[PDB]
Amino acid sequence: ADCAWLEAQEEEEVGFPVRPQVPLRPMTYKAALDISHFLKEKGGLEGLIWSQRRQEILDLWIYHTQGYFPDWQNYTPGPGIRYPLTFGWCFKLVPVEEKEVLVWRFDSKLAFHHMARELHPEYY
Amino acid sequence: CAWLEAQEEEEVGFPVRPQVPLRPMTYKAALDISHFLKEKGGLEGLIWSQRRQEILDLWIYHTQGYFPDWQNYTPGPGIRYPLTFGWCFKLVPVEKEVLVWRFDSKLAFHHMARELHPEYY
Ligand SMILES: CCCCCCCCO[C@@H]1O[C@H](CO)[C@@H](O)[C@H](O)[C@H]1O
């Protein structure tokens, strides 16, 4: 089922149901900063249990509204706290009580400290 | 049912609440959306799935405010007919069988789901 989703969205990328209304960019620091702070104030990620599908609904909402390619929202590997690889995005996945139940949590410090970078230089 | 519990939880109000106010699906709304999707969209020819229908349902729910409880079809086997009158897409088999979204403008004037299955009304 995991692989079946990738092939579906890449077919869907031209186009489904409508191609996005705005010019189609890649995710920036400031965009990711504004969208996070937006989603806290108005809208509701805070607390929700993470899933492959929910992330996709969130990725597609940003893609259709703002035009940012859904290529961006990636976190560090487990176990434990799951840090965003795209700097600017102020959400991380915390466990709640080796795969485990995660939760989107806002953290304004993520704006100033690229914690994924500091813990895993591997990726850069 | 693993999806429905997640979907219900989400309904207040992930990822944002839809911007235009909520209202139930109508004949004309369904008609207009269908004819929009054929001209300026890409629902045509695409293989159906549970997730693809949900992406479509949520795009409508967010864009236009229609609660996603309207785009259901008749049971199989064979040509799968829309229960909501106005919606001009049906799911045709390609040859549990592989279905494809197909625009049919005659669905606007004949409630084929009604004529074949009066049990649902
Ligand atoms: C799976 C999620 C599908 C995408 C849902 C969000 C798409 C909404 O899209 C936006 O809707 C606004 C009104 O709400 C309009 O003003 C914008 O022009 C439009 O881009």
Question: What structural class results from the helix and strand content of chain A?
Answer: mainly alpha
Strand tally of chain A is 2
Strand order of the largest sheet of chain A: 1-2
Q: Spell out the CATH superfamily of chain A.
A: Nef Regulatory Factor
CATH class of chain A: Alpha Beta
Oligomer: homodimer
Biggest β-sheet of chain A: count, sense, barrel? 2 strands, antiparallel
| Principal-axes shape call of chain A | globular
Number of helices of chain A: 4
Supply the number of structural domains of chain A. Answer: 1
Can you give a write-up of this model?
2 copies of one chain form a homodimer. By secondary structure, chain A is mostly helical. Chain A has one domain: Nef Regulatory Factor, CATH 3.30.62.10. In chain A, 35% of the residues lie in helices and 8% in strands. Chain A is built from 4 helices and 2 strands. In chain A, strands 1-2 form a two-stranded antiparallel ribbon. In chain A, β1 and β2 (102-106) form a beta hairpin. The longest helix of chain A is centred in the middle third of the chain and has 15 residues, at 52-66. At the A-B interface, α1 and α3 of A face α1 and α3 of B. Bound molecules: octyl beta-D-glucopyranoside (BOG). Octyl beta-D-glucopyranoside (BOG) sits between chains A (21, 57, 60-61, 64-65) and B (19, 55, 58-59, 62-63). It is classed as viral protein. Keywords: HIV-1 Nef, Dimer, viral protein.
